[PDB]
Amino acid sequence: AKPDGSIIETPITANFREGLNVLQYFISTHGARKGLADTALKTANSGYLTRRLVDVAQDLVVTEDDCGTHEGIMMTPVIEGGDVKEPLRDRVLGRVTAEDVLKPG
DNA sequence: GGGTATTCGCCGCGTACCTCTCCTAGCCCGCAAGTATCCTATTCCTTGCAGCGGT
């Protein structure tokens, strides 16, 4: 793909066991430089993201034994239109129940 | 007045480490050093006044 998001109509028809000629290598070079610059900027930003996050939740500390309530949320497997992207057994593994479940009996 | 749009200005943008260099400008006044000049001698000549033999 060329810099501005377009896809070149002529692909690179040469692997690395054989040799890339000049132009093919040029295009690959552009792609690699885009990747490198993106990693640099992306990590720079992610650092700021995490620093913001840890400074809004730093004061929270589990500090009791049981609040004694009954409200929860309905955990269900996630569906996107297609298959199950995440089953139920991996979304409630290790979270206490709110209202005892009744089997489908 | 009043609800709205548009503009202006402030706030923010990763961690840790290693190597190197450079850090005010300009005036001014004492002051050391180096020098050209001015007064200091010697040798020649021609005057002006005080002693002084001589009679």
Side-chain angles (χ1 to χ4, degrees):
Chain A
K2 62 201 301 182
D4 68 342
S6 163
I7 299 186
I8 305 181
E9 61 190 0
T10 316
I12 312 300
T13 74
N15 62 343
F16 283 150
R17 192 199 190 282
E18 296 180 346
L20 280 60
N21 60 18
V22 189
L23 274 171
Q24 302 149 14
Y25 200 90
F26 204 91
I27 306 171
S28 177
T29 290
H30 157 62
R33 179 171 297 192
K34 175 182 293 184
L36 270 174
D38 198 326
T39 60
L41 268 53
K42 164 173 57 175
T43 181
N45 177 26
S46 170
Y48 173 59
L49 169 57
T50 174
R51 169 177 141 84
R52 269 192 303 181
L53 281 178
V54 71
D55 198 355
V56 69
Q58 54 77 16
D59 58 12
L60 191 148
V61 170
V62 52
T63 184
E64 275 198 352
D65 203 2
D66 198 320
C67 64
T69 62
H70 305 84
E71 308 88 3
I73 60 179
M74 295 308 311
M75 296 301 304
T76 74
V78 66
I79 294 297
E80 75 292 339
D83 69 332
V84 285
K85 284 162 76 67
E86 191 61 20
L88 187 69
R89 204 194 65 82
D90 299 7
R91 287 176 63 89
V92 290
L93 172 59
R95 296 179 73 184
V96 72
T97 52
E99 297 305 329
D100 41 18
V101 71
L102 308 178
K103 204 175 76 61

